[PDB]
Design a protein around this ligand. Structure first.
Ligand SMILES: Nc1nc2c(ncn2[C@@H]2O[C@H](COP(=O)(O)OP(=O)(O)O)[C@@H](OP(=O)(O)OP(=O)(O)O)[C@H]2O)c(=O)[nH]1
Ligand SMILES: [Zn+2]
Ligand SMILES: [Zn+2]
Lengths: 119, 90, 49, 118, 99, 50, 1160
């Protein structure tokens, strides 16, 4: 509606391709080096039909998008940290115990020790 | 044809082909079998070919035919070697 | 261009039809630009830097 | 001096795509000349040198042309010494050096290699 | 200024100097228009390859000159082979097939 | 190159492990030297003429 | 049984996507380390950006370590380090690759105007396609329940949909998600179903996107490229030498930005690989993937989104794309300041000794070693480096008939570069023939020209047979001579006429040459008297030959001696009986048309020599008393100021309209200016009194200044009017005119005020000149870019149709005839004759046979002539249909280059065009060529019918006219604004005016006709040259308009898909092969379409030629999508590749190769 009607009605055809005009008639955060190429590509070259390919296509930043998912705090306290650390030690313990159940791990350690003492 | 070179184009239409054939003949002269037809008179091979073309001799068909005879002379006269080689690999 | 403030023309065709569209502008010596311009609909806009 | 060598490692350093004279348009990497290539003149002289030497060894004898050729190693890649040539020519060492010296005596009049020196 | 043969840049094998000789003259679009207008195909041919930025071409043709043979024996200029490698350097592939 | 080794062998080697990069007045111009000057490094053996 | 696997000759090049395995084929190893060079040893690291094993060795034939040195092992790799020891240029050609972990999207096929990865997948670009691959909103990859196939889900929606179903609609997110999306896509089945759906009961409410996508999908599927290659998983590496880090002067290396890019992408990719083996937090890994995306996108093409910085430089980094998106130096060249060389011939130029010495270096070497002198090549070097006398003589041998071509800076037309025969001159400046000094538009203010030495044999012949100055007698633009004598020489020959009464005159008669003895021996004057002599004339007719004609004519001393210069033929005397002004060129022209080349050249040299000599003998100067001011000056000024004073007094007491008294008082001063101008001219012209026999008589002033003005030689009426008369109305920065013109003049003193007023004119003059000078070339580039592809071919085709040529007559209400626009034109067919017979069918109008078109009286002022506009040719231009207008007198040689010569000739006089219902000037020409609709376009009647109102303002609306007759009506739209021209009930014809305003070329071509629209363009573009007074043939305009109407639009039903607008090339060649192929009903009828130069140049077959001028990033990408191939007939694209040009000396080569490429 707004963007389409303003762009089409105004640009007829702006004569000298007055760029510094409709770029301010656009919403969102301005002063970007991204939307710039999407306007200098439509105005000329493939005239007429390009102005119909523009709207149909119109129908951003690494760090800012990193802080976005980082926004999910889930912060912890001394109780929280100790809790998580406890689960870690519990997991590691169960794994090591599961290894202890495996007799071939013991006999292999024995064999490799005899290899160590044999230099 | 020190200054046109225009009197040569009417002998073979389209100045371009004129350049081709003249460069062809001049190429024959500068390197390989020289033997000019029109007297040199201290002129480069560039112009000598143009002089010949103007004279009426040495054209496109002329050089091509003489090349055919040249091939029939190098090949047919020296076949005793090629034929002897033909029996090399049966 | 000398610092201070001046009202610019922009007279003539700027959007077809052709109708004035005056605008004021303040030029600092060490700071940010402060412009004020009209539109065909006679609204007032401001440009910071 | 160690500090001097230290400052020779600093910086990225500069990139070729840096503007310099601000012409239309200048580039630092466009003034950098190539040196690994040889002058066409030098290459021509090298070719003419090969032909010259190949034509000079013609005015020599087989038991002298091959000697100078094999000793200094030319047109045969791997160069040999007095022993490897003295064995292939019966008489060893000094004898093959004698002829090697005599050949050098032959080249004191021709001007080809003389001017090729410079 | 005058230049027969001198140095060349590392990036593009094009004539340049100022250390012993003088960097060769620049042809350009305005000139290739004229050469095309005349129809001097061979003049533009050499002026774009061996006479400019053809690695082996310049040497081969130079030897042909000193021997009084002229001719040319041209080849693909590096100012296009580099382009091939640059385009090939991307996800896009370009190949020069025979017939 | 082998040919060059032979060539120097016939006229004397003297193949010094040094090259050449002397400042020469460019071909074409010609004149008279009016003033010489030398800026030595701080910690380098000063020259006689310097 | 060919099938060769080497680097031989190629006929075409192909552009397309590259598979990961395709990238592997170029891989001579894998870069795995961000390391470049060693910090101490300065030696290439193991697997870095500058590896020796992967790419190439540093030195020529020695490996990295040093186990192998010489040519002993050139084919064998090293044992300690796998380094193939070949050349160092190998390092310049070796590729290499980096194999990333997680997939990465190509920046080009992602965000480049249309979303190539999006449009192919039918999905929003910077909206949806961004949020799903930047790890934010998961996308679906085909579902058989509840969910569609390409919808976007959030993490909450994902788990919810996963909980409802799951384990049967799995769909990931990010790069690999889009990969599986493109891979799962079936181009074939969709190509069928889309054709089915997008054709069922749908009007013009859908057809747009339908035909668009189906054509795009069909192109992609037929291209051969698999959509999997759209996003790369393996990124190739550019050779090290194309991005080296070479040590400058005393340390301080110099590297390319690409090394920084590759180093960054390597780092980020390695961390990404390491993270996919250690602990794998989703946020960390996904971020590193986005960072890898950043690095890759920055390496391929920066653009575009913030621009990655680093490298200490505040400026961005030159990515790969930036190195191929947007002056060919050459050896054996030079340049120097030019100087006049009067003693030279016309095919010769002054080339400095030392300059020519350095130029023909290799030639001098070869010739020296050939003769003797120098024992070897280096001997010749040491011999020429030490200029040893004899060497110079050898130089005189090498430059004998070896032509050298000269060139000026601003090369507007073909005559910018002309070849000459080198002549040694003891100096450091280059001398030039003053005759061809006009073709270069060169003066001796200090301008400098460049020289090039044709090395190739055929290059020398090209310079001698084409680029030679003697071959360029006539201008390519207009048939008139270009080497025509200028200022100095013309004044000389003007002084060799100028019949003065008495003064050592008398009618002492002799016989031509004998009169010369009379002149040197004084007694008689030179400009008398007249006097009679015996002239032996020569004429020919019918059977050619020569016929003598001795007579006794009354000429002068100058005319008699000058007659000796005149060649064998010519009417004689009458060419000398005139004077020296404009007929000075006419004589040269007629001499050319009736004699030929050589005699026309020597005649030029003779008239130049004679001109200079007698000009020097004359001694015409410019004293202060040469510019005599009129006595009526102060009188006229007082009278003018009297009238304006009365007008001001009237304005004081009202009466006259004070609002526009400014205009009428301007007319007063303007009138007064013409009064002073007329007075000064009538005075300075005649004057004199002499004293013939019994005294009392009048001729024309011998006042130097007038002599210069009445004989070309840079001297116009306006300038003289400012010298002695007065500078008229002066311009004001507001654009208005001052009501107080410069009453004084340069002969008199100038007040500070009027000079401070004139400074505005000088300032704006130089300023406007600086603009139009660059604007002219700005137009020329577009002209060339659109026209430099058509060349006269296929000899001479048939066809008879062609624009009916008629003398451009403004004489309807102003009287102005021009009937020379028909000459060297090939006749259509026997254009009648008030009786019978006469003109043949294909007979080209000769220069003498166009004078025969005056023996048929003023009745015959209309002849149908074959033009380049018509012509049933295919991809070229018929020789007959063109003409002959060149430096050559005959028809254009087959396989020329009409396009470039046409464009040059048009954009040449652009330098002298003043930019502004009449626009006028260069901008007017641009608007005409671009085919732009006026600010108030008129309207025409499409079909002849009965004019009637169609509901008075019932819309909408706005008036409506409906011309209905015979069958079917039409409803045009009149927007109230602007009146009309036809009342109701009246009938109109097919293309009648119903707006009486500016006409639109589109409507004319679409309705009126092609001949009409072309006639309009040519007759409207010339009208802006008439005012500027620049002669230019209509042929060239017709040439650009030819390909200006290149494409058309078909409207019916045929093998071509209807809506597609295609060029009449394929159209005609396909309609000719369908009426006699299977059926004429399998094809439709087309309709010519008017498109501007830019719009026309935009479309072209070759993708390389397009990659030249227009935006490379677009054309290269879209050409990459569809397996396109250049093959390969264009001029431009065959220039950058560095091969023979398909025109001129080439053509034959291309023709042979073209027919050669028919076997397969
Ligand atoms: N048109 C023409 N001239 C030829 C031709 N061949 C030789 N000439 C003329 O020979 C004259 C000088 O040539 P030279 O080099 O001195 O003697 P050369 O003929 O033995 O080589 C020139 O005269 P020039 O042109 O009359 O001098 P100018 O008129 O330029 O002042 C040159 O044009 C030819 O084939 N055609
Ligand atoms: Zn090694
Ligand atoms: Zn035709």
């Amino acid at each position: 509606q707004s963007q389409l009607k303003l762009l089409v009605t105004r640009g007829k055809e702006q004569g000298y391709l007055t760029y510094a005009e409709v770029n301010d008639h656009l919403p969102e955060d301005i002063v970007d080096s991204d939307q710039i190429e999407d306007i200098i590509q439509m105005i000329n070259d493939m005239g007429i039909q390009v102005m119909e390919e523009a709207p149909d296509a119109d129908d951003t930043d690494p760090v800012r998008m990193y802080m976005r998912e980082m926004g999910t705090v889930e912060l912890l306290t001394r109780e929280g940290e100790i809790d998580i650390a406890k689960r870690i030690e519990d997991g590691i313990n169960q794994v090591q115990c599961s290894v202890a159940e495996y007799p071939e791990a013991i006999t292999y350690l024995l064999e490799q020790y005899d290899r160590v003492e044999a230099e | 044809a020190r200054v046109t070179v225009q009197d040569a184009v009417e002998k073979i239409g389209n100045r371009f082909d004129l350049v081709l054939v003249a460069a062809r003949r001049a190429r024959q002269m500068q390197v390989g079998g020289k033997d000019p037809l029109v007297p040199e008179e201290n002129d480069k091979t560039t112009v000598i070919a143009l002089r010949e073309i103007e004279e009426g001799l040495i054209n496109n068909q002329i050089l091509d035919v003489r090349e055919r005879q040249e091939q029939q002379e190098q090949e047919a006269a020296e076949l005793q070697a090629v034929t002897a080689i033909a029996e090399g690999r049966r | 261009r000398s610092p201070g403030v001046f009202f610019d023309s922009d007279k003539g065709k700027t959007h077809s039809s052709g109708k004035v569209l005056y605008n004021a502008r303040i030029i600092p010596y060490r700071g940010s630009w402060l412009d004020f311009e009209f539109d065909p609909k006679d609204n007032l806009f401001v440009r910071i830097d | 001096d160690k500090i001097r060598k230290v400052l020779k490692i600093a910086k990225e350093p500069i990139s070729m795509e840096t503007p310099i004279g601000d012409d239309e348009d200048s580039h630092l990497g466009d003034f950098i000349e190539d040196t690994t290539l040889e002058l066409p003149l030098d290459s021509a002289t090298t070719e003419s040198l090969r032909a010259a030497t190949h034509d000079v060894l013609a005015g020599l004898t087989a038991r002298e042309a091959k000697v100078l050729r094999m000793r200094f190693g030319i047109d045969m890649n791997t160069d040999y010494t007095l022993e490897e040539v003295g064995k292939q020519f019966d008489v060893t060492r000094e004898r093959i050096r004698q002829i090697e010296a005599k050949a050098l005596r032959k080249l004191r009049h021709p001007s080809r290699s003389e001017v090729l020196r410079s | 200024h005058a230049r027969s043969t001198g140095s060349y840049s590392l990036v593009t094998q094009q004539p340049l100097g100022g250390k012993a000789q003088f960097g060769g003259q620049r042809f350009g679009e305005m000139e290739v228009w004229a050469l095309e207008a005349y129809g001097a195909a061979y003049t533009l041919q050499e002026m774009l390859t061996v006479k400019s930025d053809d690695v082996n071409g310049r040497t081969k043709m130079y030897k042909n000159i000193v021997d009084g043979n002229h001719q040319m024996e041209p080849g693909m200029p590096e100012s296009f082979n580099v382009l091939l490698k640059e385009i090939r350097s991307l996800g896009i592939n370009i190949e020069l097939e025979d017939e | 190159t082998p040919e060059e080794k032979l060539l120097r062998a016939i006229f004397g080697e003297k193949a010094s492990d040094v090259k050449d990069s002397s400042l020469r007045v460019p071909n074409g111009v010609s004149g008279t030297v009016i003033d010489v000057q030398v800026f030595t490094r701080d910690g380098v053996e000063k020259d006689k003429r310097a | 049984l060919k099938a060769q696997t080497k680097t031989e000759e190629f006929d075409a090049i192909k552009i397309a996507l590259a598979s990961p395995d395709m990238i592997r084929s170029w891989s001579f190893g894998e870069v795995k380390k961000p390391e470049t060079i060693n910090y101490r040893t300065f030696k290439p690291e193991r697997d870095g950006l500058f590896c020796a094993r992967i790419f190439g060795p540093v030195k020529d034939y020695e490996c990295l370590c040093g186990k192998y040195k010489r040519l002993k092992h050139r084919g064998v790799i090293c044992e300690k380090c796998g380094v193939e020891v070949t050349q160092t240029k190998v390092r310049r050609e070796r590729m290499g690759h980096i194999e990333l972990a997680s997939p990465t999207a190509h920046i080009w096929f992602l965000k480049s105007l249309p979303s190539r990865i999006g449009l192919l997948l039918d999905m929003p670009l910077r909206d949806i396609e961004r949020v799903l691959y930047f790890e934010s909103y998961v996308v679906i990859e085909g579902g058989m329940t509840n969910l569609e196939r390409q919808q976007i889900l959030t993490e909450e929606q994902y788990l919810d949909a996963l909980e409802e179903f799951g384990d049967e609609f799995d769909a990931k997110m990010g790069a690999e998600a889009i990969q599986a999306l493109l891979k799962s896509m079936d181009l074939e089945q969709e190509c069928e179903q889309l054709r089915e759906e997008l054709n069922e009961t749908n009007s013009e409410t859908k057809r747009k996107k339908l035909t668009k996508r189906i054509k795009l999908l069909e192109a992609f599927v037929q291209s051969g490229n698999k959509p999997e290659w759209m996003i790369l998983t393996v990124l190739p590496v550019l050779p090290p030498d194309l991005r080296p880090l070479v040590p400058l002067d005393g340390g301080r290396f110099a590297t390319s930005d690409l090394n920084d890019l590759y180093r960054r992408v390597i780092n980020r990719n390695n961390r990404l690989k390491r993270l996919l083996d250690l602990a794998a937090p989703d946020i960390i890994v996904r971020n590193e993937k986005r960072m890898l995306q950043e690095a890759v996108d920055a390496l391929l093409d920066n653009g575009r989104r913030g621009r990655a910085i680093t490298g200490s430089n505040k400026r961005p980094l030159k990515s790969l794309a930036d190195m191929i998106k947007g002056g060919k130096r050459v050896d054996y060249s030079g340049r120097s300041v030019i100087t006049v060389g009067p003693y030279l011939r016309l095919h010769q130029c002054g080339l400095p000794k030392k300059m020519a010495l350095e130029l023909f270096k290799p030639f001098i070497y070869g010739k020296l070693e050939l003769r003797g002198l120098a024992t070897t090549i280096k001997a010749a070097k040491k011999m020429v480096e030490r200029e040893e006398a004899v060497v110079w003589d050898i130089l005189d041998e090498v430059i004998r008939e070896h032509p050298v071509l000269l060139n000026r800076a601003p090369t507007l037309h073909r005559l910018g570069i002309q070849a000459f025969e080198p002549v040694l001159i003891e100096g450091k400046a280059i001398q030039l023939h003053p005759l061809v000094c006009a073709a270069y538009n060169a003066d001796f203010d200090g301008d400098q020209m460049a020289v090039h030495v044709p090395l190739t044999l055929e290059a020398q012949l090209e310079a001698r047979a084409l680029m030679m100055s003697t071959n360029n007698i006539l201008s390519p633009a207009n048939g008139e001579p270009i080497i025509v004598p200028s200022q100095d020489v013309v004044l000389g020959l003007y002084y060799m006429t100028r019949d003065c009464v008495n003064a050592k005159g008398e009618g002492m008669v002799l016989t031509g040459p004998k009169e010369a003895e009379r002149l040197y021996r004084s007694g008689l004057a030179s400009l008398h008297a007249r006097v009679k002599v015996r002239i032996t004339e020569y004429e020919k007719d019918a059977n050619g030959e020569l016929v003598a004609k001795t007579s006794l004519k009354d000429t002068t001393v100058g005319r008699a001696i000058l007659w000796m210069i005149v060649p064998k033929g010519l009417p004689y005397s009458i060419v000398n009986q005139a004077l020296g002004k404009k007929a000075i060129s006419k004589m040269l022209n007629t001499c050319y048309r009736i004699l030929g080349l050589k005699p026309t050249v020597i005649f030029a040299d003779q008239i130049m020599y004679t001109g200079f000599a007698y000009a020097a003998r004359s001694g015409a100067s410019v004293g202060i008393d040469d510019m005599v001011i009129p006595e009526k000056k102060h009188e006229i000024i007082s009278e003018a100021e009297a009238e304006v004073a009365e007008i001001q007094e009237q304005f004081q007491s009202g009466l006259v309209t004070a609002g526009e008294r400014y205009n009428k008082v301007i007319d007063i001063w303007a009138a007064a200016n013409d009064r002073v101008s007329k007075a000064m001219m009538d005075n300075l012209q005649t004057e004199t009194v002499i004293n013939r026999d019994g005294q009392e008589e009048k001729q024309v002033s011998f006042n130097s200044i007038y002599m210069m003005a009445d004989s070309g030689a840079r001297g116009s009426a306006a300038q003289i009017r400012q010298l002695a008369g007065m500078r008229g109305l002066m311009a004001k920065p507001d654009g208005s005119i001052i009501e107080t013109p410069i009453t004084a003049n340069f002969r008199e003193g100038l007040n500070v005020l009027q000079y401070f007023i004139s400074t505005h004119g000088a300032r704006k003059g130089l300023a406007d000149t600086a603009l139009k000078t660059a604007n002219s070339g700005y137009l020329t580039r577009r002209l060339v870019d659109v026209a430099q592809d058509l060349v006269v071919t296929e000899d001479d085709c048939g066809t008879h149709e062609g624009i009916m040529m008629t003398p451009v007559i403004e004489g309807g209400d102003v009287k102005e005839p021009l009937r020379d626009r028909v000459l060297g034109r090939v006749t259509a067919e026997d254009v009648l004759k008030p009786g019978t017979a006469d003109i043949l069918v294909p007979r080209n109008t000769l220069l003498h046979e166009q004078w025969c078109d005056l023996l048929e009286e003023n009745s015959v002022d209309a002849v149908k002539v074959r033009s380049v506009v018509s012509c049933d040719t295919d991809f070229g231009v018929c020789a007959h249909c063109y003409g002959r207008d060149l430096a050559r007198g005959h028809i254009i040689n087959k396989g020329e280059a009409i396009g470039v010569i046409a464009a040059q000739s048009i954009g040449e006089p652009g330098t002298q065009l003043t930019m502004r219902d009449i626009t006028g000037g260069l901008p007017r020409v641009a608007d005409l060529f671009e085919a732009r609709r006026p600010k108030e376009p008129a309207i025409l009647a499409e079909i002849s019918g009965i004019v009637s109102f169609g509901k008075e303002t019932k819309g909408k609306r706005r008036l409506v006219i409906t011309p209905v007759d015979g069958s079917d009506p039409y409803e045009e739209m009149i927007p109230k604004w602007r009146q009309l021209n036809v009342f109701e009930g009246e009938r109109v014809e097919r293309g009648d005016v119903i707006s009486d305003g500016p006409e639109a070329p589109h409507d004319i071509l679409r309705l009126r006709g092609v001949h009409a629209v072309t006639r309009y363009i040519v007759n409207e573009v010339q009208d802006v040259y008439r005012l500027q007074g620049v002669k230019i043939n209509d042929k060239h305009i017709e040439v650009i308009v030819r390909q200006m109407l290149r494409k058309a639009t078909i409207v019916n039903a045929g093998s071509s898909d209807f809506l597609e607008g295609e060029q009449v090339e394929y159209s005609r060649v396909k309609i000719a092969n369908r009426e006699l192929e299977a059926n004429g009903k399998v094809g439709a009828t087309y309709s010519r379409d008017l498109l501007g130069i830019t719009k026309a140049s935009l479309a072209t077959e070759s993708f390389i030629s397009a990659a030249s001028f227009q935006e490379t990033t677009r054309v290269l990408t879209e050409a990459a999508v569809a397996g396109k191939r250049d093959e390969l007939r264009g001029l431009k694209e065959n220039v950058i590749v560095g091969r023979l040009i398909p025109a001129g000396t080439g053509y034959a080569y291309h023709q042979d190769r073209m027919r050669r490429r028919a076997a397969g």
